[PDB]
């Protein structure tokens, strides 16, 4: 008494499945398989997934659902001292919402430019091109491919920007796509999860439709089999390699959505006795299975290119947006009925980003809705007052220097910020709140306590897991750079400012809570660490 609940729980599943499955699934996982020991990468991947990844994902879903409240109130309910974690987690998603919807806008901007039987990115003869242009991907950074130039020169107009200090004029063709996205988001998140959980039926399930079409499309392509070899052909030498276990650990962590408070928010709308743990691993499996399936969708087209298009495999296979907005479309244009694959592909990218942003924004709304009764009864005015903030600042990503702004938040906005956030999540839950109390909570929900396995991972494996990633993250750290452009020392300082801005709340809200509570130290401590009961 009293909270809105998911309609069918397939709403919740598809909502969480949708949130968990995004562009990273397509442009990252496959690259890591190609990069590390082929299919042998699955070994460290699975291991890191079992001990590190799922236990954290399981945690948030079980945590949010039980406490039955938004991210902030959830940690305010759990460990009021660490309630800053709820604050930190929510504004982490608040930050991401700025640069993230840009990729969907890109997807739509490509979706708009994709109506024709002549695709613009297959040509080096166009107005925006360069004498250095290639028909397809090349080794030399100086010479961009044809599809690469289209993305950089036309859509982004990134060449107009000398760096981050120069954003350049706004591209209003881009801002339209951005707003078109927010309109989709607003009307999806308008009435709350009631409408949200219903919308995810498309956004979450559409990609799988497209993935099948493209998977069938790719595997039929000449040399398609060759791509899978570059994909799944195992080198177990990588298994011994430390960097591979890091990529596995990192990917499994960032592939699942913990730390954004979305899972906390989403699962909280669940029925109290609704099985989470079943949903936890079901959602997790579908997520990883999706990437695995998508992996074939990607490298099937790559083997085609290396065969039919005469392109070096290492040149075409790439992570990040470069794969989706350049490499892949480049092969589609060569394919018969290109416009079809293009249209559905870019629609897939949008649908892959849409249900994700739903969760992210939902985490802010839900967290605030439970914390503040005003905006709770005020909603749909809030998402406007929110998304309006986004789009206004979103114009910064619609500029000619757009990607430069994007890439900055991408490496910062959800940073180590989420690592230390989730680390304090795991530590606050496993030690501060205790595993004895947590397993006790789930038993009262799903009917049975979490296995000895799960408790161990939360207490030990997870913390070192995040630590294993956070340490190896700082060990390979380099000042932010894209292409030949290196970000200035002030630009990096702002990125860290964004990273700290979240996590700083944890200690800050800790001191704020400590200063607000009377009594001696040990007294002031326990009172702040005493859970919402009663």
């Amino acid at each position: 008494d009293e909270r809105e609940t998911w309609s069918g729980k397939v709403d919740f599943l598809l909502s969480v499945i949708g949130f968990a499955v995004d562009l990273a699934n397509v442009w990252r996982f496959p690259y890591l398989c190609y990069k590390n020991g082929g299919g042998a990468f699955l070994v460290p991947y699975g291991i890191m997934l079992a001990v590190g990844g799922i236990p954290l994902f399981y945690m948030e879903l079980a945590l949010g659902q039980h406490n039955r409240k938004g991210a902030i109130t959830c940690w305010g309910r759990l460990v009021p001292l660490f309630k800053g974690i709820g604050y930190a987690v929510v504004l982490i998603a608040f930050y991401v919402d700025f640069y993230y919807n840009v990729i969907i806008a890109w997807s739509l901007r490509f979706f708009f430019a994709s109506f024709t039987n002549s695709l613009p990115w297959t040509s080096c003869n166009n107005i925006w091109n360069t004498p250095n242009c290639r028909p397809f991907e090349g080794h030399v950074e100086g010479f961009q491919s044809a599809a690469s130039e289209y993305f950089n020169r036309y859509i982004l107009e990134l060449n107009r920007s000398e760096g981050i200090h120069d954003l350049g004029a706004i591209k209003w063709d881009m801002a339209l796509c951005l707003l078109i996205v927010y309109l989709i988001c607003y009307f999806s998140l308008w009435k709350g999860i009631s409408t949200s959980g219903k919308v995810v039926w498309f956004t979450a399930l559409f990609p799988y439709a497209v993935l099948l079409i493209l998977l069938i499309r790719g595997l039929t392509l000449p040399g398609s089999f060759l791509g899978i070899q570059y994909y799944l052909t195992p080198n177990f030498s990588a298994i011994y390699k430390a960097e591979v276990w890091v990529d596995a650990a990192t990917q499994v962590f960032f592939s699942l959505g913990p730390g954004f408070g979305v899972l906390l928010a989403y699962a909280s709308y669940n029925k109290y006795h609704n099985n989470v743990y079943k949903d936890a691993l079901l959602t997790s499996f579908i997520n990883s299975a999706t990437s695995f399936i998508a992996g074939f969708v990607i490298f099937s087209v790559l083997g085609y290119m290396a065969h039919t298009l005469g392109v070096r495999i290492e040149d075409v296979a790439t992570e990040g947006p470069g794969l989706v907005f350049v490499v892949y479309p480049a092969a589609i244009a060569t394919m018969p009925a290109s416009t079809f694959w293009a249209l559905i592909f870019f629609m897939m990218l949008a649908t892959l980003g849409l249900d994700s942003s739903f969760g992210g924004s939902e985490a802010i709304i839900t967290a605030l809705s439970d914390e503040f009764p005003k905006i709770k009864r005020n909603r749909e005015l809030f998402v406007a007052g929110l998304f309006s903030l986004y789009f206004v600042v979103g114009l910064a990503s619609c500029t000619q220097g757009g990607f430069y702004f994007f890439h900055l938040l991408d490496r910062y906005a959800a940073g180590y910020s989420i690592l230390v956030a989730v680390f304090f999540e795991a530590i606050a839950v496993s030690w501060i709140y205790g595993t004895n109390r947590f397993s006790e909570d789930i038993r009262d929900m799903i009917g049975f306590p979490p296995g000895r396995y799960w408790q161990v991972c939360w207490r030990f494996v997870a913390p070192i897991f995040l630590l294993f990633i956070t340490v190896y993250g700082l060990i390979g750290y380099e000042p932010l750079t894209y292409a030949d452009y290196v970000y200035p020392s002030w630009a990096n300082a702002l990125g860290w400012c964004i990273a700290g801005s979240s996590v700083v709340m944890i200690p800050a809200v800790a001191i704020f809570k400590l200063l607000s509570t009377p009594g001696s130290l040990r007294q002031r401590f326990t009172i702040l660490t005493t859970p919402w009961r009663d």
Epitope: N436, S439, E440, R443, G447, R533
Partner: antibody, heavy 119, light 109 residues
Framework: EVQLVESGGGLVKPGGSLKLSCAAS????????MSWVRQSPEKRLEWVAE????????YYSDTVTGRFTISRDNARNILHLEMSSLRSEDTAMYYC????????????WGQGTTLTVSS | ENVLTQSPAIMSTSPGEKVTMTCRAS???????LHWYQQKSGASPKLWIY???NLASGVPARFSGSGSGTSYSLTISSVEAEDAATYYC?????????FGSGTKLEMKR
């Protein structure tokens, strides 16, 4: 191995109160949740109250609700049941059981302690 | 309250003959949330079948279970003198927790 010993109980005048205890051994008590299941002289099994591992979740049947208070000691591995304003209908042999996994039911029961409420 | 009624209440079977006892619930219960108990005369009840198909520790394979929704049944392949007792089903689907009417199995001679 697992041994549940239930103590207390006896004759109690209606309206009176009586405290019951279950001595648990052979397993970690703080891990498993406990439930009091009573059986009337007519051989009628009725779940009375359940308490979780930490004992922060308590469930009572509509029959004994508010009259009975089920306590827990994880240090001494002792499950109590605090009865108040007892009723003639409350006459039965109370059992101590676990009680942890809902999907597995109650795997271990005690010997039982007998309660008789009569004037 | 979910009311679990069992039947028959008193059942007679000679050793080796197959027997089937049923537990029908007023409300539907998760197949994993229903359990059976065997209470021998003057003995404390013991967990017999859990999650409706699953025998407990020490329970002979001669025992079996089935059903779903509001209808569950405990069955003995070939009954033995050892099997003479009163059998109680149970539902954990929701509180308050409830036990079946019970089925008293008596050997015929």
């Amino acid at each position: 191995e697992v041994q549940l010993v239930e103590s207390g109980g006896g004759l109690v005048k209606p309206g009176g109160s009586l405290k019951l205890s279950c001595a648990a051994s052979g397993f970690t008590f703080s891990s498993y949740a406990m439930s009091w299941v009573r059986q009337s002289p007519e051989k009628r099994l009725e779940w009375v109250a359940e308490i979780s591992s930490g004992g922060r979740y308590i469930y009572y049947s509509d029959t004994v609700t508010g009259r009975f208070t089920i306590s827990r000691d994880n240090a001494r591995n002792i499950l109590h049941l605090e009865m108040s304003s007892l009723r003639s209908e409350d006459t039965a042999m109370y059992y101590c059981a676990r009680g942890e996994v809902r999907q597995r039911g109650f795997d271990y029961w005690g010997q039982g302690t007998t309660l008789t409420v009569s004037s | 309250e979910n009311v679990l009624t069992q039947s028959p209440a008193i059942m007679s079977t000679s050793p080796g003959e197959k027997v089937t006892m049923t537990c029908r619930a007023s409300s539907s219960v998760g197949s994993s949330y229903l359990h059976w108990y065997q209470q021998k005369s003057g003995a404390s009840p013991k967990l017999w079948i859990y999650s409706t198909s699953n025998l407990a520790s020490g329970v002979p394979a001669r025992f079996s279970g089935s059903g779903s929704g509001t209808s569950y049944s405990l069955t003995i392949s070939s009954v033995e003198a050892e099997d003479a007792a009163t059998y109680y089903c149970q539902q954990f689907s929701g509180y308050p927790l409830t036990f079946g009417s019970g089925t008293k199995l008596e050997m015929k001679r």
